């Protein structure tokens, strides 16, 4: 349907998959990384009804489905379900055949090896894609943001990777990776709202809480002052409409959940928080690198859309940083949608045509080729 | 010798082209049944021989 064998770009995370073609500005479609399955016995006959549902089908029919995510903390653990998600992504909504297009997939630099290897195998064996590449999330964010140097703090649904990059090169000894993510904030919000009389323990309830989080929650610039008021007055509560007509209001819980990014102890995690790890990613780099990383804190990934987060991340690191020097945050309206955007940019670069793995080299090496050719 | 190389190459390509046609046919057959199931969804409530005996008897 395209006038060129443009690469397909699929930003497959632990949240939603954003997909479209290289050279465009935006994904053609977005899909929950979900395969749904009925938890009930059918009663009426000739009702259609699938054994399993994929993406938005799984979410739309969720009233009686248990919903599973094949990707956890950035890694595919269930590749049969990813084959279904990709079939849907490519043939039902983008309506393209990867057999005629190179495909670009994304991951964090320390994502366990099985992820990129199974992603490579699925696209070469079930879709028979002519070429593959698995790209770095930080690289993709840097292209989207217009930078070659900076800290990419990618606090999304799966993991926070936090990798410093200088002149387009990794500074791997300074990756302050953290097992704290948007999915934990969602789990925390389900629990804290349960305490308000609105229990959220089932799949339908979990999807509702994620929707509540995305629309009602924030981190603010000053937690203690924000809570001093939110805990004292109803003036800071915000309502939300649930699908069945219930109305829930959230007070200080509205920010106490999200605050776990700065205070991980709220969910039992042992961590300094995302702002200290951002600071250390800069500090652990050489002294002649530090000045450029301080001036370029690059925000990407999920959770970047919480009110007060860009302002707060700059405040928290500038407060740890030395005086005289200027410390700055980069947080464009392209935040979180930067990995997909970077995929489009990267896939299309003329210099990247030497990075793509072809369905030639693949057959001689097998999917393990991804560890020889990508990064 | 060039022709032998050409016939060998053309059948390799031919297999893939036939497979591509087969894949689109398969998608039509699958889409067609989904449409038929949806058709039944709305036609079913009236597929009866009705209200004849009501007056005859």
């Amino acid at each position: 349907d395209e006038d060129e064998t443009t690469a397909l770009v699929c930003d497959n995370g632990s949240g939603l998959v954003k997909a479209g073609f290289a050279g465009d500005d935006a994904p053609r479609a977005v899909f929950p990384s979900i395969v749904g399955r009925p938890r009930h016995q059918g009663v009426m006959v000739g009702m259609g009804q699938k054994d399993s549902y994929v993406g938005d089908e799984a979410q739309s029919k969720r009233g009686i489905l248990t919903l599973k995510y094949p990707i956890e903390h950035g890694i595919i653990t269930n590749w049969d379900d990813m084959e279904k998600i990709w079939h849907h992504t490519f043939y039902n909504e983008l309506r393209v055949a990867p057999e005629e297009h190179p495909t670009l997939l994304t991951e964090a630099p320390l994502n366990p090896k099985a992820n990129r290897e199974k992603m490579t195998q699925i696209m070469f064996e079930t879709f028979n894609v002519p070429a593959m590449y698995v790209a770095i999330q930080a690289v993709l964010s840097l292209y989207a943001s217009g930078r070659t140097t900076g800290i990419v703090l990618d606090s999304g649904d799966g993991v926070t990777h936090n990798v410093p990059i200088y002149e387009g090169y990794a500074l791997p000894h300074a990756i302050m990776r953290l097992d704290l993510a948007g999915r934990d904030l969602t789990d925390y919000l389900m629990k804290i709202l349960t305490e308000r009389g609105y229990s959220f323990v089932t799949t339908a309830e979990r999807e509702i809480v994620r929707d509540i989080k995305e629309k009602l929650c924030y981190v603010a610039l000053d937690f203690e002052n924000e809570m001093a008021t939110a805990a004292s007055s109803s003036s800071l509560e915000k309502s939300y409409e649930l699908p069945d007509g219930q109305v829930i209001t959230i007070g200080n819980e509205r920010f106490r959940c999200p605050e776990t990014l700065f205070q991980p102890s709220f969910i039992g995690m042992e961590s300094a928080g995302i702002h200290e790890t951002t600071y250390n990613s800069i500090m652990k780099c050489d002294i002649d690198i530090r000045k450029d990383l301080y001036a370029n804190n690059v925000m990407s990934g999920g959770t970047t859309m919480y009110p007060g987060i860009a302002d707060r991340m700059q405040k928290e690191i500038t407060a740890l940083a030395p005086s005289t020097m200027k410390i700055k945050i980069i947080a464009p309206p392209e935040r979180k949608y930067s990995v997909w955007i970077g995929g489009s940019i990267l896939a299309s670069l003329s210099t990247f045509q030497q990075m793509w793995i072809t369905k030639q080299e693949y057959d001689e090496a097998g999917p393990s080729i991804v560890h020889r050719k990508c990064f | 010798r060039q022709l032998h190389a050409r016939v060998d190459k053309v059948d390799e390509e031919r297999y893939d082209i036939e497979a591509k046609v087969t894949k689109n046919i398969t998608e039509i057959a699958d889409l067609t049944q989904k449409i038929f199931d949806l058709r039944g969804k709305f036609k079913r409530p009236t597929l009866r021989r009705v209200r004849i005996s009501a007056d005859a008897m």
Partner: peptide
């Protein structure tokens, strides 16, 4: 002290 692609590759070549 005591692969799905290998299958398709073979089909087209055979």
């Amino acid at each position: 002290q005591n692969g799905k692609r290998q299958t398709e590759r073979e089909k087209k070549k055979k």
